[PDB]
């Protein structure tokens, strides 16, 4: 019925303050649509290390995506996508932070670059994992295929590679005519 969704958004040194801003606006437009609804949200920034910008019980208190994300700062470091997903599996999906044990686990990962680390995300095996690779780094099939090990199977449906950050607007409208 109800779902717990975590936004795992990139904050590396390859993002431009405008491109970082577009991701932030994207996450909001999504929340805004999925409001008056049995969803609750959390947002984690990742780079070299990882930070919960707001958790679930922050969301259910505040509700406003604008007010929830106003303290966000651009990390401007690396892209440790492996350590990031593990961090979301063990640190964020806890009832300590307001997560519901009956709610299904969803993870929206947003990145503009390949992982700067290694390992596995076996800790996040019961989490539904979407991954969004954004332009000019995933401008080759080989690099786009690196995101498949992060997503849920099949990649055909759980991986989206966008050409430009301006195309995050396009993606949002897609989801509006979707069920």
């Amino acid at each position, epitope marked *: 019925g109800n779902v717990d969704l975590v936004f795992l958004f990139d904050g590396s040194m390859s993002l431009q303050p*405008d491109e970082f*801003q577009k991701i*932030l606006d994207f996450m*909001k437009d999504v929340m805004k649509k999925l409001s008056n609804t049995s969803y609750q949200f959390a947002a984690v920034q990742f780079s070299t290390s990882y930070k919960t910008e707001f958790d679930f019980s922050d969301y259910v208190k505040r509700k406003d995506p*604008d*007010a929830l994300l*106003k303290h*966000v700062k*651009h990390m*401007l470091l690396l892209t440790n996508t492996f350590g990031a997903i593990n961090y979301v599996a063990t640190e964020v999906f806890r009832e300590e932070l307001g997560a519901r044990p009956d709610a299904t686990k969803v993870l929206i990962i947003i990145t503009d670059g390949e992982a700067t680390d290694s390992g596995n995300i076996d800790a996040a095996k019961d989490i539904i994992r979407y991954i969004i690779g954004i332009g000019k780094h995933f401008q080759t099939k080989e690099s786009q295929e690196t995101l498949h090990k992060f997503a849920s199977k099949p990649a055909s449906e759980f991986v989206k590679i966008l050409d430009t950050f301006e195309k995050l607007k396009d993606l949002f409208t897609e989801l509006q005519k979707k069920i």
Partner: antibody
Amino acid sequence: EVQLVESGGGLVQPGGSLRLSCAASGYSFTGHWMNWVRQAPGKGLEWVGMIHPSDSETRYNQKFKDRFTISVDKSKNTLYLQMNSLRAEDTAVYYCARGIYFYGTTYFDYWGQGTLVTVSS
Amino acid sequence: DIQMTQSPSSLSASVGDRVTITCRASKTISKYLAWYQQKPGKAPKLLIYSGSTLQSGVPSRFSGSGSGTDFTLTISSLQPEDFATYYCQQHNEYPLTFGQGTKVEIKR
């Protein structure tokens, strides 16, 4: 385009009040911190304080916190600065400037055109 | 608070010269310094932030440098359009403090 148009400046007597306005356009007004900066004639820039329109959270320069009050109206996409118990040194050009919060504390990328406030009897 | 000290207070240089404006900090502010260009009657305009990052739209003839207390704006190859007081600002802690400005005038 990002537009910041200010109004409300003019002549005001010592001990008098005045509310400035900053009309914001061309971007999501509730997505950026807003700032007030002032400049006395032929002098430098002074930070007054900031406000986040979403929930109207504020941070002031303590130099200004007593007599200056920053508020917002999300419905009008408008930022206010309420000045009280004014005096001669408050004569300045008052700018509203959109801030970036990403790096360090805050810097300003978009500024208003400014408005002169003259405190005189 | 952090006192931002600019050097010099005013200057004059001919078109095509290297202008070096220095901003110094009361105490360490990492790399988080910003430069503004203010033209007559107009509002200040962002040139540099985080010590050395050029804003989008600003000509690459503008360059920021420095970390800690000593910072430098270098306008290389000065232009007639480049007449306009320059202010520096610290964005490392609150309150936000500006320099005092340096008038850059043009020898012809």
